[PDB]
Coordinates of C-alpha atoms in Angstrom, one line a residue:
Chain A
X1 CA -5.6 -8.5 36.1
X2 CA -4.3 -11.6 34.3
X3 CA -1.0 -11.5 32.4
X4 CA -1.2 -14.5 30.0
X5 CA 0.2 -14.2 26.5
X6 CA -3.4 -14.5 25.2
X7 CA -4.9 -11.9 27.7
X8 CA -2.2 -9.5 26.9
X9 CA -2.6 -9.8 23.1
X10 CA -6.4 -9.5 23.4
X11 CA -6.2 -6.3 25.5
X12 CA -3.7 -4.9 23.0
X13 CA -6.1 -5.7 20.1
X14 CA -9.0 -4.0 22.0
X15 CA -6.7 -1.1 22.8
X16 CA -5.7 -1.1 19.1
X17 CA -9.3 -0.5 18.1
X18 CA -9.6 2.3 20.5
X19 CA -6.4 4.4 19.9
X20 CA -4.7 3.3 16.9
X21 CA -1.2 2.1 16.2
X22 CA 0.5 5.5 16.9
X23 CA -1.5 5.9 20.1
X24 CA -0.6 2.4 21.3
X25 CA 2.1 2.3 23.9
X26 CA 3.1 -0.1 26.6
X27 CA 2.2 2.6 29.3
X28 CA -1.5 2.5 28.1
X29 CA -1.5 -1.2 27.8
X30 CA -0.3 -1.5 31.5
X31 CA -3.0 1.0 32.5
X32 CA -5.6 -1.0 30.5
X33 CA -4.6 -4.1 32.3
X34 CA -4.4 -2.5 35.6
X35 CA -0.9 -3.4 36.5
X36 CA 2.4 -1.4 37.2
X37 CA 4.6 -0.8 34.2
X38 CA 7.5 -3.0 35.6
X39 CA 5.0 -5.8 36.0
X40 CA 4.1 -5.6 32.4
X41 CA 7.8 -5.2 31.3
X42 CA 8.5 -8.8 32.6
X43 CA 5.9 -10.0 29.9
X44 CA 6.3 -7.5 27.1
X45 CA 9.6 -5.8 26.7
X46 CA 8.6 -3.0 24.3
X47 CA 6.1 -1.7 21.7
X48 CA 8.0 -3.5 18.8
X49 CA 7.6 -6.9 20.6
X50 CA 3.8 -6.1 21.1
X51 CA 3.4 -5.2 17.4
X52 CA 5.1 -8.3 16.1
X53 CA 2.7 -10.4 18.2
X54 CA -0.3 -8.4 17.0
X55 CA 0.6 -9.0 13.3
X56 CA 0.8 -12.8 13.8
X57 CA -2.5 -12.8 15.8
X58 CA -4.4 -10.6 13.3
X59 CA -3.5 -13.1 10.5
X60 CA -3.8 -16.3 12.5
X61 CA -7.1 -15.4 13.7
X62 CA -8.7 -14.2 10.4
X63 CA -6.6 -15.0 7.4
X64 CA -8.2 -18.4 7.1
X65 CA -7.7 -19.0 3.3
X66 CA -3.8 -18.8 3.4
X67 CA -3.3 -22.2 1.8
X68 CA -4.7 -23.6 -1.5
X69 CA -7.4 -26.3 -0.9
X70 CA -6.2 -29.4 -2.6
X71 CA -7.5 -29.6 -6.1
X72 CA -8.3 -25.9 -6.7
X73 CA -7.2 -23.7 -9.5
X74 CA -4.4 -21.2 -9.0
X75 CA -6.9 -18.6 -10.2
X76 CA -9.4 -19.5 -7.5
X77 CA -6.5 -19.6 -4.9
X78 CA -5.1 -16.1 -5.6
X79 CA -8.6 -14.7 -5.6
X80 CA -9.8 -16.4 -2.4
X81 CA -6.5 -15.7 -0.8
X82 CA -6.4 -12.0 -1.5
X83 CA -10.0 -11.6 -0.2
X84 CA -9.0 -13.3 3.0
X85 CA -6.0 -11.2 3.3
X86 CA -8.0 -8.1 2.9
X87 CA -10.9 -8.9 5.2
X88 CA -8.2 -9.9 7.8
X89 CA -6.4 -6.6 7.4
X90 CA -9.7 -4.6 7.7
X91 CA -10.8 -6.3 10.9
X92 CA -8.7 -4.0 13.1
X93 CA -7.9 -0.2 13.1
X94 CA -4.6 0.4 11.3
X95 CA -4.4 -3.4 10.7
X96 CA -2.5 -2.9 7.4
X97 CA 0.0 -0.7 9.2
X98 CA 0.5 -3.3 12.0
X99 CA 1.1 -5.9 9.2
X100 CA 3.3 -3.5 7.1
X101 CA 5.7 -2.7 9.9
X102 CA 6.5 -6.2 11.1
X103 CA 8.9 -8.7 9.4
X104 CA 7.7 -12.2 8.7
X105 CA 8.3 -15.2 11.1
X106 CA 8.6 -18.9 10.6
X107 CA 4.7 -19.4 10.4
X108 CA 4.5 -17.1 7.3
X109 CA 7.6 -18.5 5.6
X110 CA 6.2 -22.1 5.6
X111 CA 2.9 -20.6 4.3
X112 CA 4.7 -18.8 1.5
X113 CA 6.8 -22.0 0.8
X114 CA 3.5 -24.0 0.2
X115 CA 2.0 -21.3 -2.0
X116 CA 5.2 -21.2 -4.2
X117 CA 5.3 -25.0 -4.5
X118 CA 1.6 -24.7 -5.5
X119 CA 2.3 -22.0 -8.2
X120 CA 5.2 -24.0 -9.7
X121 CA 3.2 -27.2 -9.7
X122 CA 0.6 -25.4 -11.8
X123 CA 3.2 -24.6 -14.5
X124 CA 4.6 -21.4 -12.8
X125 CA 8.3 -20.6 -13.0
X126 CA 9.8 -19.7 -9.5
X127 CA 10.2 -16.1 -10.3
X128 CA 6.9 -15.5 -12.1
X129 CA 5.1 -17.4 -9.4
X130 CA 6.8 -15.3 -6.9
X131 CA 5.9 -12.1 -8.8
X132 CA 2.4 -13.3 -9.0
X133 CA 2.0 -13.9 -5.2
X134 CA 3.8 -10.4 -4.6
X135 CA 1.7 -8.4 -7.0
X136 CA -1.5 -9.7 -5.3
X137 CA -0.1 -8.7 -1.9
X138 CA 1.0 -5.3 -3.0
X139 CA -2.3 -4.5 -4.6
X140 CA -4.3 -5.8 -1.7
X141 CA -2.2 -3.8 0.8
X142 CA -2.3 -0.5 -1.2
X143 CA -6.1 -0.9 -1.6
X144 CA -6.6 -1.5 2.2
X145 CA -4.3 1.2 3.2
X146 CA -6.0 3.6 1.0
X147 CA -9.4 2.7 2.6
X148 CA -8.4 2.6 6.4
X149 CA -6.7 5.9 5.9
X150 CA -9.8 7.6 4.4
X151 CA -15.6 19.1 -7.8
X152 CA -15.0 18.5 -11.6
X153 CA -17.6 16.9 -13.9
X154 CA -16.5 13.4 -14.9
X155 CA -15.1 13.0 -11.4
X156 CA -18.4 14.1 -9.7
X157 CA -20.3 11.8 -12.0
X158 CA -18.0 8.7 -11.3
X159 CA -17.3 9.6 -7.6
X160 CA -20.7 8.4 -6.6
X161 CA -20.0 4.8 -7.6
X162 CA -16.8 4.7 -5.7
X163 CA -18.3 6.3 -2.6
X164 CA -21.4 4.1 -2.4
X165 CA -19.3 1.2 -1.4
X166 CA -16.5 0.3 1.0
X167 CA -14.1 -0.1 -2.1
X168 CA -14.7 -3.8 -2.4
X169 CA -16.0 -3.5 -6.0
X170 CA -13.0 -1.6 -7.3
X171 CA -10.8 -4.1 -5.6
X172 CA -12.5 -7.2 -6.9
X173 CA -12.5 -5.7 -10.4
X174 CA -8.7 -5.0 -10.3
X175 CA -8.0 -8.4 -8.8
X176 CA -9.6 -10.0 -11.8
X177 CA -7.7 -7.9 -14.2
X178 CA -4.6 -8.8 -12.3
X179 CA -5.2 -12.5 -12.4
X180 CA -6.1 -12.5 -16.1
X181 CA -2.8 -10.7 -17.0
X182 CA -1.0 -13.7 -15.2
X183 CA -3.1 -16.2 -17.3
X184 CA -2.1 -14.3 -20.6
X185 CA 1.6 -14.6 -19.3
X186 CA 1.5 -18.2 -18.0
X187 CA 0.0 -19.6 -21.2
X188 CA 2.3 -17.6 -23.4
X189 CA 5.6 -19.3 -22.5
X190 CA 8.3 -18.5 -25.1
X191 CA 6.0 -16.7 -27.6
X192 CA 5.7 -12.9 -28.2
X193 CA 2.7 -11.8 -26.3
Chain B
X1 CA 17.0 32.2 8.8
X2 CA 14.6 32.8 5.9
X3 CA 10.9 31.9 6.4
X4 CA 9.7 31.8 2.8
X5 CA 7.1 29.1 1.8
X6 CA 9.8 27.7 -0.5
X7 CA 12.6 27.7 2.2
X8 CA 10.3 26.2 4.8
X9 CA 9.2 23.3 2.5
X10 CA 12.7 22.6 1.4
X11 CA 14.0 22.5 5.1
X12 CA 11.1 20.2 6.0
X13 CA 12.0 17.9 3.0
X14 CA 15.7 17.8 4.1
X15 CA 14.5 17.1 7.6
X16 CA 12.2 14.5 6.4
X17 CA 15.2 12.7 4.9
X18 CA 17.0 12.9 8.1
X19 CA 14.3 11.8 10.7
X20 CA 11.3 10.4 8.9
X21 CA 7.6 11.2 9.1
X22 CA 7.2 10.2 12.9
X23 CA 10.2 12.1 13.9
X24 CA 9.2 15.3 12.0
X25 CA 7.7 17.9 14.3
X26 CA 7.3 21.7 14.1
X27 CA 9.7 21.9 17.1
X28 CA 12.6 20.2 15.2
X29 CA 11.7 22.2 12.0
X30 CA 11.9 25.5 14.0
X31 CA 15.3 24.3 15.5
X32 CA 16.5 23.4 12.1
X33 CA 15.6 26.8 10.7
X34 CA 17.1 28.5 13.9
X35 CA 14.1 30.5 14.8
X36 CA 11.7 30.6 17.9
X37 CA 8.8 28.3 17.8
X38 CA 6.2 31.2 17.8
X39 CA 8.0 32.8 14.8
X40 CA 7.5 29.6 12.9
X41 CA 3.9 29.1 14.1
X42 CA 3.0 32.4 12.2
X43 CA 4.0 30.6 9.1
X44 CA 3.3 26.9 9.7
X45 CA 0.3 26.3 12.2
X46 CA 1.0 22.5 12.7
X47 CA 2.5 19.2 11.6
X48 CA -0.7 18.4 9.5
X49 CA -0.4 21.7 7.5
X50 CA 3.3 20.9 6.9
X51 CA 2.6 17.3 5.8
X52 CA -0.1 18.5 3.3
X53 CA 2.4 20.9 1.7
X54 CA 5.0 18.3 1.6
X55 CA 2.8 15.8 -0.3
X56 CA 2.0 18.4 -3.0
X57 CA 5.7 19.3 -3.3
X58 CA 6.9 15.7 -3.6
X59 CA 4.6 15.1 -6.4
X60 CA 4.8 18.5 -8.1
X61 CA 8.6 18.2 -8.0
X62 CA 9.1 14.8 -9.4
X63 CA 5.7 13.2 -10.6
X64 CA 6.4 14.7 -14.1
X65 CA 4.4 12.1 -16.1
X66 CA 1.0 12.9 -14.5
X67 CA -0.9 13.8 -17.8
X68 CA -1.0 11.8 -21.0
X69 CA 1.1 13.1 -23.8
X70 CA -1.3 14.0 -26.8
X71 CA -1.4 11.0 -29.1
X72 CA -0.3 8.3 -26.9
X73 CA -1.8 4.9 -26.0
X74 CA -3.8 4.5 -22.8
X75 CA -1.4 1.5 -22.1
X76 CA 1.6 3.7 -22.5
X77 CA 0.1 6.3 -20.3
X78 CA -0.9 4.0 -17.3
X79 CA 2.7 2.5 -17.6
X80 CA 4.7 5.7 -17.7
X81 CA 2.4 7.3 -15.1
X82 CA 2.8 4.5 -12.6
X83 CA 6.6 4.6 -13.1
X84 CA 6.6 8.4 -12.5
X85 CA 4.4 8.0 -9.4
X86 CA 6.7 5.3 -8.1
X87 CA 10.0 7.2 -8.7
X88 CA 8.5 10.3 -7.1
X89 CA 7.3 8.4 -4.0
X90 CA 10.8 6.8 -3.6
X91 CA 12.7 10.1 -3.8
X92 CA 12.0 10.9 -0.1
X93 CA 12.0 8.8 3.2
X94 CA 8.6 7.7 4.0
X95 CA 7.4 9.5 0.8
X96 CA 4.6 7.0 0.4
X97 CA 3.4 7.6 4.0
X98 CA 3.4 11.3 3.5
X99 CA 1.3 10.9 0.3
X100 CA -1.0 8.3 1.9
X101 CA -1.9 10.5 4.9
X102 CA -2.9 13.7 2.9
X103 CA -6.2 14.2 1.2
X104 CA -6.0 15.5 -2.5
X105 CA -6.3 19.2 -3.4
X106 CA -7.5 21.1 -6.4
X107 CA -4.3 20.4 -8.4
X108 CA -4.7 16.7 -8.1
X109 CA -8.4 16.8 -8.9
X110 CA -7.8 18.5 -12.3
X111 CA -5.1 16.0 -13.0
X112 CA -7.5 13.2 -12.2
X113 CA -10.2 15.0 -14.4
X114 CA -7.9 14.9 -17.4
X115 CA -6.9 11.3 -17.1
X116 CA -10.6 10.2 -16.8
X117 CA -11.5 12.2 -19.8
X118 CA -8.5 10.5 -21.4
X119 CA -9.6 7.0 -20.4
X120 CA -13.2 7.4 -21.6
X121 CA -12.0 9.0 -24.9
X122 CA -10.1 5.7 -25.5
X123 CA -13.4 3.6 -25.2
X124 CA -13.4 3.4 -21.3
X125 CA -16.6 3.5 -19.3
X126 CA -16.4 6.0 -16.5
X127 CA -16.4 3.4 -13.7
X128 CA -14.0 1.0 -15.5
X129 CA -11.7 3.8 -16.3
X130 CA -11.9 5.0 -12.7
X131 CA -11.1 1.4 -11.6
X132 CA -8.1 1.2 -13.9
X133 CA -6.5 4.3 -12.6
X134 CA -7.3 3.3 -9.1
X135 CA -5.9 -0.3 -9.4
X136 CA -2.7 1.2 -10.7
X137 CA -2.3 3.6 -7.8
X138 CA -3.2 0.9 -5.2
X139 CA -0.6 -1.5 -6.7
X140 CA 2.1 1.2 -7.0
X141 CA 1.5 2.4 -3.4
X142 CA 1.5 -1.1 -1.9
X143 CA 4.7 -2.0 -3.8
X144 CA 6.5 1.3 -2.8
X145 CA 5.3 1.0 0.9
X146 CA 6.6 -2.6 1.0
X147 CA 10.0 -1.4 -0.2
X148 CA 10.4 1.8 1.9
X149 CA 9.4 -0.1 5.0
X150 CA 12.0 -3.0 4.4
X151 CA 14.9 -20.5 5.1
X152 CA 12.7 -22.9 3.2
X153 CA 13.9 -24.5 -0.2
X154 CA 11.9 -22.9 -2.9
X155 CA 11.9 -19.5 -1.1
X156 CA 15.6 -19.5 -0.6
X157 CA 16.1 -20.4 -4.3
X158 CA 13.7 -17.7 -5.5
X159 CA 14.6 -15.1 -2.8
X160 CA 17.9 -14.3 -4.5
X161 CA 16.1 -12.9 -7.6
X162 CA 13.9 -10.6 -5.5
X163 CA 16.8 -9.4 -3.3
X164 CA 19.3 -8.6 -6.1
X165 CA 17.1 -5.7 -7.2
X166 CA 15.2 -2.7 -5.5
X167 CA 12.0 -4.4 -6.4
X168 CA 11.6 -2.7 -9.8
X169 CA 11.5 -5.9 -11.8
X170 CA 8.6 -7.5 -9.9
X171 CA 6.8 -4.2 -10.0
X172 CA 7.2 -3.7 -13.8
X173 CA 6.1 -7.4 -14.3
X174 CA 3.0 -6.8 -12.2
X175 CA 2.2 -3.6 -13.9
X176 CA 2.2 -5.3 -17.3
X177 CA -0.1 -8.0 -16.1
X178 CA -2.4 -5.4 -14.7
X179 CA -2.5 -3.5 -17.9
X180 CA -3.2 -6.6 -20.0
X181 CA -6.2 -7.5 -17.8
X182 CA -7.6 -4.2 -18.6
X183 CA -7.1 -4.7 -22.4
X184 CA -8.9 -8.1 -22.1
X185 CA -11.6 -6.3 -20.2
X186 CA -11.8 -3.2 -22.5
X187 CA -12.0 -5.1 -25.8
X188 CA -14.6 -7.6 -24.4
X189 CA -17.6 -5.2 -24.0
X190 CA -20.8 -7.2 -23.6
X191 CA -19.3 -10.7 -24.3
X192 CA -18.6 -13.4 -21.7
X193 CA -14.8 -13.2 -21.1

């Protein structure tokens, strides 16, 4: 079996879809690849190192709308961006947990740097622009984690709407509400709003 | 050592703070209590059963603002409620993960039922009221999980503001933005907003 960075990562992603993040160990990866554990150790030192590479790969392979298209509205950006982030996180089993547990690397920081410059350039104060980008992530993460991880009157009645969908509707609705609140805040400046 | 539902739960919460959710097993709970594993088994059948009780207890013991105080604004409710939920989730190590992994019980459903009746009574459509309550949870969960789980120019400059706080500011800012977006939606009805 071939032990190239690419092949290792892909086998790990395949294994991720089969056993999940808790059930993913270097032992099983070695057995999946059909190679002795010490052979694998030379390439991947531990589960932590494997996870970090997985998080990078998950995003790099599906989070395609990470940077604002030149001449686009900040609203449009935050919307498309959150949608990309969500789709990417849903592509793999426990994808959100893999992402949640890893710290960001150089690639993500330059991406974050761009978006911040983008926010400010559109009339956003550094902190408020930071808070905008953060709130979107937090809300997208919580929504995705709720999903991947999973009677009274009004609740029975309402429940049918939530259930007959993968949760996309509720998410998109909340996203809009979040984006609007920022508009109301952006265009308020020093006035009492 | 005493094996009363209360004593077991408290020991488990104490152990939770020491070893975390992954490091929490019935074996260690039995050793903490100073009793043979089969003695404990009679009381707690497995880790899943222990987790479910922990989630209920965490909330029941700290999520005090779960129901709207008679004669309060829906805005005030969602705000105080989200704050209570956050504080409660932060009280214990991996508190968000304990909550995330358990399915709701009768206690939570009646609480959810009340809040929905409360939302509708304030001019909210069942689905929109559901979406409002859900978006708040998702955002609070993602914010809390980000926290419990954890250089370019603009980012270095902004980073100092985020870091000199436990993340409460950013959270409260996003909460307000979320609540406003709902106002704009509630008071829009059948108009193009």
